[PDB]
Write a protein that binds this ligand. Structure first.
Ligand SMILES: Nc1nc(C(F)(F)F)ncc1COP(=O)(O)OP(=O)(O)O
Ligand SMILES: [Mg+2]
Length: 219
């Protein structure tokens, strides 16, 4: 994964969303970077640097943590995605950026990031359709499981029913036990934080997701 000179293809984007690990320093009791390295070693196909909130790093501390996470993604050969922060995404030459409905407008972000990967969080058919024309390469629908209202795989099913094929990754309380339906509903992958970041064995946790997700995408 080098500097993209063209928009990422749906086939390649969908392969990456399979097991999508999201994590910040405050989502685990162990060593942040060490957990990420294990998640990759395990089988995670994409990672998103998400550092914000209460016990979250700031200033230089944050940036360096990001560089280490990105470095670990490099070794594993997995794309490094940044959350919210467009300025940082561009500075670290990250593979992508993810935004929600309250973050910078997708149109602007797309113009500022060139052909970088762009993920947009959607919650309604409208937001999905908008994300697509705004130039998003994929959308994160949810929260599927238990603020924003839980929606199961209803939206995911509505999107596929309208024939829309945009890459989709599910998000929200996803565990190894409830991930299958998300896929069966038509999602191209599942996103998780605690299911892996808080596992006593993150590496094996990521490995289980990898096996399950591949099994269900085939069937
Ligand atoms: N971070 C996210 N990542 C995904 C992804 F698709 F990547 F799985 N989907 C949805 C969200 C939620 O985005 P948002 O509401 O902006 O809040 P926050 O930045 O606090 O997560
Ligand atoms: Mg956000």
């Amino acid at each position: 994964h080098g500097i993209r000179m063209t928009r990422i293809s749906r086939e390649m984007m969908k392969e990456l969303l399979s097991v999508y690990f999201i994590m910040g320093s405050n989502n685990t009791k162990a060593d942040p970077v060490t957990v990420v390295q294990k998640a990759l070693k395990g089988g995670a196909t994409l990672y998103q640097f998400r550092e914000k909130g209460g016990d979250a790093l700031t200033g230089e501390a944050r940036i360096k943590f990001a560089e280490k996470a990105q470095a670990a993604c490099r070794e594993a050969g997995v794309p490094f995605i940044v959350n919210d922060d467009v300025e940082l995404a561009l500075n670290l030459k990250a593979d992508g950026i993810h935004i929600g409905q309250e973050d910078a407008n997708a149109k602007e972000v797309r113009a500022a990031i060139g052909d970088m990967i762009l993920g947009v969080a959607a919650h309604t058919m409208s937001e999905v359709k908008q994300a697509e024309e705004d130039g998003a390469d994929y959308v994160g629908l949810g929260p599927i499981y238990p603020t924003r209202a839980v929606q199961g795989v209803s939206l995911i099913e509505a999107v596929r029913r309208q024939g829309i094929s945009i890459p989709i990754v599910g998000i929200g309380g996803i565990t190894i036990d409830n991930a299958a339906p998300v896929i069966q509903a038509g999602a191209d992958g599942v996103s998780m934080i605690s299911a892996i970041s808080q596992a006593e064995d993150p590496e094996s946790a990521a490995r289980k997701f990898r096996e399950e997700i591949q099994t269900y995408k085939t069937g």
